[PDB]
A and B are shown apart, each in its own frame.
Chain A
Amino acid sequence: FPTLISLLEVIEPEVLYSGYDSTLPDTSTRLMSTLNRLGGRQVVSAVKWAKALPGFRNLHLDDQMTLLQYSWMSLMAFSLGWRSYKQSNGNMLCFAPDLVINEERMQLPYMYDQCQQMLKISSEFVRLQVSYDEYLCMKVLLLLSTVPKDGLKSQAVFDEIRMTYIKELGKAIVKRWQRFYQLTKLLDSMHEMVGGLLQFCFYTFVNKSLSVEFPEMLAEIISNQLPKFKAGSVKPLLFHQ
């Protein structure tokens, strides 16, 4: 009887703390290793959030696993895009309150491009003047937005879970065609914006020279994900063609 929107509100994780010590010199290897460590933690937080998600637990495990594996990057980039929108109006990446990345430190090697792609997400929030509630329902739909070409085990429970959150975003729009059209195209563009961050992730993950550290959690997710993208057996759910 409390609305689904108010439940999403209370399972929303409190932002994690990085512990980045900008007392030492900034380097791109260090900063990337810190992002990934903060990332591995954010992801554990996002598993708890998914587990608390009305309906999510009703999928088979193979499905629950598939969905977090295929959307973790999308989840974290979407939240980062929000944090940057709220805390700095989309000007600077707010990775944590103790880690912001201004164009001083976009100027480090490797950083500019990947920080541009991330800011892009941020500026879409700025363009559309997204609400908090819009963001929350959209974020759930991100979790449900990439599936295997062979489909899921429990496709049935899945289709009805997506149905619920589609309605919920609908609600969120109105407690505030065209709007819904715009937001679902924003969802559609997350696959493209996120494919490129994934690609940079995979690059840093495999490149020996660069020595970027990943936590064991991520490393196993990324290691199992890299073959499936090689094969192109990963299917985006799109609202629009």
Chain B
Amino acid sequence: RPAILYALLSS
């Protein structure tokens, strides 16, 4: 799982 993309979607 790609961390930046992941963090962007759960903001």
Contacts and interface: CB of A to CB of B under 8 A. Distances in A.
Interface of A: 44, 47, 51, 61, 64-65, 68-69, 216-217, 220-221, 223-224
Interface of B: 1-6, 8-10
Contacts of B3: 220
Contacts, number: 30
Contacts of A224: 1-2
18 contacts: A44-B8, A47-B8, A51-B9, A61-B6, A61-B10, A64-B9, A65-B2, A65-B5, A65-B6, A65-B9, A69-B5, A216-B4, A217-B5, A220-B4, A220-B5, A221-B2, A224-B1, A224-B2
A47 B5 contact: yes
B9 to A, nearest CB: 5
A223 B4 contact: no
B2 to A, nearest CB: 4
A61 B10 CA distance: 7
B8 to A, nearest CB: 5
Contact of B2 (A51, A61, A64, A220): A220
Contacts of B8: 44, 47
Q: Tell me whether chain A's interface is mostly helix, strand or loop, or mixed.
A: helix
A69 B5 CA distance: 8
Contacts of A217: 4-5
A217 B8 CA distance: 10
B5 to A, nearest CB: 6
Contact of B1 (A47, A51, A65, A216): A65
Which residue, of B1, B3, B4, B9, has the highest number of chain A Cβ atoms within 10 A?
Answer: B9
A64 B7 CA distance: 11
A65 B11 CA distance: 13
A65 B10 CA distance: 10
Contacts of A220: 2-5
